[PDB]
């Protein structure tokens, strides 16, 4: 239950990062909740 | 009775009484674990905005206008007007507030008689956040852990505490998982929106008691929270041309998101040499 | 022994001790610190109030709860 | 930070103006007009306030009839900070050590002292390890942001009870803080060209980093000869 | 066993002892945390109660209830 709510929230982060497109000034992103957990 | 200096304690009884209170002390004096709490609070908001409008002014046959475009028709071409015949703009003109205070694009054109003025806006921001208060504390205590700042609050005033917060009681029962009793929040001073009553504060708060693995990250709470809002002024029939249709209405638009999750995990102590590591 | 010290798991100690009032009403108190509950009666007693608490500590379930709020509104 | 945007204005067909960019176009080409046709700009030119304080490259260029204006501001700070506050005392004997300020507060006020503090009562169980009640913050006056209710304070604060071993060094707590904020202000369909499209918008980027460890290391002098060394 | 200790379904602990109360008036309490029961008294009494609390704590309706308001106001 926890882990589908971690991974679905860390799912829609890294889509941000690949959402953002290069050539145009944004902001950096924010390291990634963690891969290991679970 | 006590020695509180010393931490010792004094029983006077019968050799039978103290061999049976013997044993209840070194059962009731045993070592208590420790807890290691982590929270994490991550939050992601954005949200994009568009607000683009056409008006057209006709002295031949009239003009349509729409405030909340930033400017109006009416009140720019009295600017503009003056600002061909003086050259310039004195801070005096009416249009200079209008103008000095402006976001996006205005295009105007001129056909013949017909004025013409586009003003679009396209904003989008966003915003993340990542919070991870962690407390070591001996189980059954309480413990607090406060990163913020504290603040006056009217009512004669009042000393309010605003910021990360963490307050949790562990209870380790029993060998692994834990009982914690969780309150905490991530609470802010709002720099806009000051008032004569006091200051407000931006409050994210949650608190719950969760029984959780002693290795586990699990999500105490969240909020999901999605907005959409539309507006449009037009002109009734002509407005609604599928395509030409937008020339004669102003369109602004809005968006927001916000996703919120907190985990929490602890972590049990057992001895030294797991709390050096 | 007379007194025997139960080490509670998954209930509170304070908590217990109420609730066990109750039915001594026997002396049952409780250790804040250790989370741990001293009851000193005869070993009749003990053997009874060792069912109770074992039936009285046991593990509580958890609830995710999720709220859906959806609105909409419009006019012209 | 980072916060940079193009602004271009044009007589013949309109202009594109971002406040925020610390000066607007429009503004901008009324001040620098006022310039060259007066030589310089008294105080009383609405355009005085707004270039008097301005931080950046500001950029302007002039093909032909279109003017156009480039604001550029990349700030960084770094801010680095280690506090050892350290007291002796005897076990179960509480002490306190306050370096800090005793500041007034109003309620008819009040006296709170502020600064480093550190309020622990030690327990030495037995032979090694200890039981420490920790009660300590970093807290100062903030200097911004003072109002007619009082003063604010920063405050780092943990307090909790930890039982650590005699020579070890040992985490109470932390915070690991992160923030990155954004925001572009562009012309809809222009500002979204993947390269060109920064022409037409105003991007103005943040981001923040807090990174808080606590540690205790208790000690213990069972004798004088341990407690000279 | 003198004291049984039982697990309310579909009933609040706290709630049951008052009205067990006065049945009894036996010691009837409840533990909050857990949501059980917990009673005790003679053999006879725990058998003649334990029909007493499995009548009183049955299932519950519930209602969905929709008001609908109109009005229409028109004047010239």
Do not use: C, H
């Amino acid at each position: 239950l926890s882990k589908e709510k971690y991974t679905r929230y860390r799912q829609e982060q890294q889509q941000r990062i690949d959402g953002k497109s290069k050539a145009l000034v944004g902001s950096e992103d924010l390291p990634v909740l963690d891969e290991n957990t679970f | 009775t006590a020695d509180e200096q010393t931490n010792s304690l004094v029983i006077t009884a019968d050799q039978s009484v103290q061999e049976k209170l013997a044993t209840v002390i070194a059962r009731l004096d045993i070592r208590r674990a420790q807890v290691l709490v982590e929270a994490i609070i991550v939050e992601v908001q954005d949200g994009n905005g568009l607000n683009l409008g056409v008006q057209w002014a006709n002295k031949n046959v009239g003009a349509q206008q729409f405030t909340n475009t930033g400017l109006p028709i009416f009140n720019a071409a009295q600017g503009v007007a003056d600002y061909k015949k003086n050259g310039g703009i004195t801070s005096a003109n009416p249009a200079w507030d209008m103008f000095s205070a402006y976001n996006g694009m205005a295009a105007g054109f001129f056909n013949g008689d017909w004025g013409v003025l586009l003003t679009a806006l396209a904003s989008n921001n966003k915003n993340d956040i990542l919070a991870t208060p962690s407390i070591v504390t001996l189980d059954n205590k309480l413990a607090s852990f406060n990163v913020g700042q504290d603040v006056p609050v009217l009512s004669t005033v009042e000393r309010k505490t605003v910021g990360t917060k963490l307050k949790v009681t562990p209870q380790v029962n029993e060998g692994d998982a834990v009982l914690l009793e969780i309150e905490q929040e991530v609470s802010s001073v709002d720099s806009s929106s000051n008032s004569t009553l006091g200051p407000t504060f931006n409050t994210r708060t949650i608190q719950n008691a969760v029984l959780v693995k002693t290795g586990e990250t699990v999500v105490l709470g969240g909020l999901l929270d999605d907005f959409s809002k539309e507006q449009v002024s037009k002109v009734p029939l002509l407005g609604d041309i599928p395509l030409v249709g937008q020339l004669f209405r102003y369109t602004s638009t809005e968006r927001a998101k916000r996703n919120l999750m907190v985990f929490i995990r602890p972590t049990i102590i057992r001895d030294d040499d797991v709390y050096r590591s | 022994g007379n007194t025997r010290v139960y080490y509670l798991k998954y209930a509170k100690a304070t908590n217990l001790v109420e609730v066990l009032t109750g039915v001594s009403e026997v002396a049952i108190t409780a250790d804040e610190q250790t989370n741990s509950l001293v009851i000193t009666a005869d070993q009749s007693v003990q053997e009874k109030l060792a069912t109770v608490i074992a039936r009285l500590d046991i593990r509580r379930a958890q609830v995710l709860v999720e709220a859906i709020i959806v609105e909409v509104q419009d006019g012209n």
